[PDB]
Design a protein around this ligand. Structure first.
Ligand SMILES: OC[C@H]1O[C@@H]2O[C@H]3[C@H](O)[C@@H](O)[C@@H](O[C@H]4[C@H](O)[C@@H](O)[C@@H](O[C@H]5[C@H](O)[C@@H](O)[C@@H](O[C@H]6[C@H](O)[C@@H](O)[C@@H](O[C@H]7[C@H](O)[C@@H](O)[C@@H](O[C@H]8[C@H](O)[C@@H](O)[C@@H](O[C@H]1[C@H](O)[C@H]2O)O[C@@H]8CO)O[C@@H]7CO)O[C@@H]6CO)O[C@@H]5CO)O[C@@H]4CO)O[C@@H]3CO
Length: 490
């Protein structure tokens, strides 16, 4: 059936819908908007569940009330929900609207131990998220950073058990770094980065520096140091000793460092997803993580922006398919971004390859047999953006005689705003929702399009890092159509 071609569309809710004071501010206003979405055929919505609002008062002082009133209203409006366990800061830059820090009691510990924060070579502390170096350090009033995350997710599961039982929540995305993405904070606008700066390595806090020196001593080179020649945030790769042609990234020292640095994210990801699987075990929910789409310098050999972010991806070393393989023991979804972007829209000197990056990451996921979802990175209201999302959602088009060979598990559109709901904009969005649904009407029962959610099974066994790293072998991507066969039309 054509309904086997249906890809669900979710919309991201406005930022700060429950504010920093844990108040669901405007139920009436949100409700008119949600009902517009329900009539346009949208399948669900997505919301951040900010750790800095919930566990603000102190360790295990959770207040779930205002998020319970929000989930109640989404359910009354007939929409499902993707929930993000957001363990990161919202906003906080100059010009930002809603600013929600991580818990003040965590920030107070940070006042006496600055090394709980990701740190660059200059010694600047990024406070958006806790460094992977403290994941198993019992320094937060007896808890390690992963026990804080685990406890938060167990409390969410217990206190929202009625919305979980009644099937409101489709999936739980677990925030794994800055902006909820599994990466280092290598391109902080708060420290002056501007596209397409290569960014900077964020491994200089004392826990990660110490771990690196222990690791180079075991490899037989105790003298090796953390990079001192990779430049600054706004550098271009050829003006740096680390990323130029035949530079340090290609030496024994550079490769060992890049393997260590990227391996820290796989393991960070693997251990917290272990806890998420335990917390939500038995629930009719899928688990997901978000990978960032870092497309600038993708078209040059060095892939510098990708490497400073922690994705050790080169033309001869796949740095994304190890992440897909890791997610398969957890039966999790890889949620990616840049689904709307065309290469032709990027400034030429950025050496930007969003279309190719997307084809590489989604093909890597389908090859590893996991489910792949995605978002647009920037707000777009035009038909060419929507037709690019429809092309990536079904790369080889609609199958008239079955399910597509390749299709995404879903797409979340970023952000519900008054601009989206403006008349000419919302008319084009309604056509996008239709074409995503492969010209079928909204289908309330996911089982009809083969998206039924079972009870969350326990994680399959730990895959050793060397088996994870066999997925670095480069493969050719699946074939993409030039343009979609299910066009919104201009
Ligand atoms: O707060 C900022 C922003 O943060 C989040 O986005 C992150 C994103 O997810 C990452 O992928 C990355 O983004 C970089 C991106 O990937 C690169 O491609 C590049 O962007 C270039 C565009 O790709 C390219 O098309 C062009 O953009 C032009 C637009 O096409 C054109 O329409 C106009 O853009 C204006 C917007 O239309 C307008 O709406 C307004 O945007 C604001 C948003 O409304 C607001 O929601 C917020 O956005 C968030 C975003 O939601 C998060 O996902 O702030 C926006 C900025 O104030 O203003 C735009 C103009 O300022 O003009 C532009 C060209 O000027 O060029 C760009 C740049 O070369 O760089 C991206 C990083 O800057 O990182 C971001 C940030 O973390």
């Amino acid at each position: 059936n054509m309904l086997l071609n249906y890809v669900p569309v979710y919309v991201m809710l406005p930022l700060g819908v429950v504010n920093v004071d844990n108040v669901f501010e405007d139920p009436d206003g949100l409700k008119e908007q949600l009902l517009q979405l329900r009539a346009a055929g949208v399948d669900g919505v997505m919301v951040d569940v900010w750790w800095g609002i919930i566990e603000l008062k102190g360790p295990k002082q959770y207040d779930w009330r205002a998020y319970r009133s929000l989930l109640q209203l989404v359910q009354e409006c007939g929409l499902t929900l993707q929930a993000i366990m957001s363990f990161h800061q919202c906003g906080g830059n100059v010009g930002d609207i809603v600013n929600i820090p991580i818990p003040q009691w965590v920030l107070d510990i940070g006042e006496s131990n600055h090394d709980i924060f990701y740190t660059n070579r200059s010694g600047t502390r990024n406070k958006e998220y806790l460094t992977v170096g403290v994941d198993n350090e019992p320094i937060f009033h007896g808890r390690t950073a992963i026990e804080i995350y685990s406890d938060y997710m167990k409390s969410f599961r217990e206190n929202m058990s009625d919305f979980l039982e009644s099937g409101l929540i489709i999936d739980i995305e677990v925030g794994l770094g800055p902006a909820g993405e599994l990466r280092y904070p290598s391109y902080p606008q708060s420290q002056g980065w501007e596209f397409p700066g290569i960014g900077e390595f964020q491994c200089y806090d004392k826990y990660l520096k110490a771990d690196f020196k222990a690791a180079v001593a075991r490899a037989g080179h105790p003298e090796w140091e953390l990079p001192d020649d990779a430049g600054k945030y706004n550098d271009v790769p050829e003006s740096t000793g680390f990323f130029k042609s035949n530079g340090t990234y290609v030496t024994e020292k550079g490769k060992f460092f890049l393997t260590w640095y990227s391996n820290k994210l796989l393991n960070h990801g693997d251990q917290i997803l272990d806890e998420a699987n335990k917390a939500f075990l038995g629930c009719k929910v899928k688990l997901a993580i978000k990978v960032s789409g870092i497309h600038w310098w993708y078209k040059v050999e060095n892939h510098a922006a990708e490497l400073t972010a922690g994705y050790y991806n080169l033309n001869d070393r796949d740095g994304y398919r190890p992440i897909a393989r890791m997610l398969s023991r957890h039966h999790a979804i890889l949620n990616f971004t840049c689904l709307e972007m065309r290469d032709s829209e990027q400034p030429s000197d950025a050496k930007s390859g969003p279309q190719e990056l997307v084809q590489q990451v989604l093909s890597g996921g389908w090859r590893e047999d996991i489910r792949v979802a995605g978002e647009n990175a920037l707000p777009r209201y035009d038909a060419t953006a929507y037709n690019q999302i429809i092309l990536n959602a079904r790369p080889q088009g609609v199958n008239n005689n079955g399910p597509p060979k390749l299709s995404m598990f879903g797409v979340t559109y970023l952000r519900l705003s008054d601009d989206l709901l403006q008349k000419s904009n919302f008319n084009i969005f309604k056509k996008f929702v239709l074409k995503m649904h492969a010209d079928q009407d909204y289908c309330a029962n996911p089982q009809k399009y083969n998206h039924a959610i079972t009870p969350l099974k326990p994680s399959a066994p730990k895959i050793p890092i060397e088996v994870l790293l066999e997925a670095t072998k480069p493969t050719l991507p699946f074939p993409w159509l030039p343009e979609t066969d299910m066009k919104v039309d201009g």
